[PDB]
Design a protein around this ligand. Structure first.
Ligand SMILES: [Hg+2]
Ligand SMILES: [Hg+2]
Lengths: 134, 134
């Protein structure tokens, strides 16, 4: 039953829908990666703003401080990297959706012309039969 | 609430719908005009194929024949003319719909780019805030 344009338009439409969902997944992922990174940086600042006791007595504190900050910075670097990765994925998913969206419009335009051609053909053949016989 | 594109796209969409209904009215009218013309031509042929009695005695028949055929031909000419008028209206309504359909797609394309720009802006501003502070 399908036709030339319709089958191709249907595929393009599906590609568009697929691309939009992919874009949605990438965006949600990028937003979550940023929230996770954000939480770590806040944890860091609160931990810092807080670092205000003794000398060698609170030496264990200086030590704990150094170890933790290094561990936290490590986490922050990895999450920053992850955000960079999600960001790139969003950019690509967005570009992909845009072009498939443009491909779909192109098939839509062809169909509109087909609707035109068909209506025009019907108009001519339905009266040709009774125009000349006049 | 409306925006630049949306208000314009909404108008274009309405123009498209209006044009499609106009096209529908013109097509239905053209189809009916052709059916009416068709009926008359059949009436004519049946009347003719039928014209097969006397001489001066059936003179009233020759007379009736001439008067009726002339009356029918007159009707046929007017209906042929009406069909010509509907046909031209269909052609124009079709052209109008096509271009408004193309105007709508153009506004659709702009909106798609706006969806892109917005998603991209959101992505950048939501992490700018936590990218540098890193
Ligand atoms: Hg993000
Ligand atoms: Hg017609």
């Amino acid at each position: 039953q399908h036709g030339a344009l319709e089958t191709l338009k249907d595929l393009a439409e599906k590609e568009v829908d697929d691309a939009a969902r992919l874009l949605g997944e990438m965006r949600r992922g990028c937003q979550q990666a940023e929230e996770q990174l954000k939480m770590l940086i806040d944890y860091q600042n609160e931990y810092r703003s807080n670092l205000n006791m003794g000398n060698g007595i609170a030496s264990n504190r200086w030590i704990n401080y150094q170890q933790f900050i290094q561990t936290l910075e490590k986490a922050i670097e990895q999450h920053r990297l992850q955000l960079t990765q999600w960001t790139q994925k969003v950019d690509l998913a967005l570009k992909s959706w845009r072009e498939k969206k443009q491909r779909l419009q192109a098939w839509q335009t062809l169909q509109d012309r087909q609707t035109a051609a068909a209506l025009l053909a019907e108009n001519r053949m339905d009266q040709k039969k009774m125009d000349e016989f006049a």
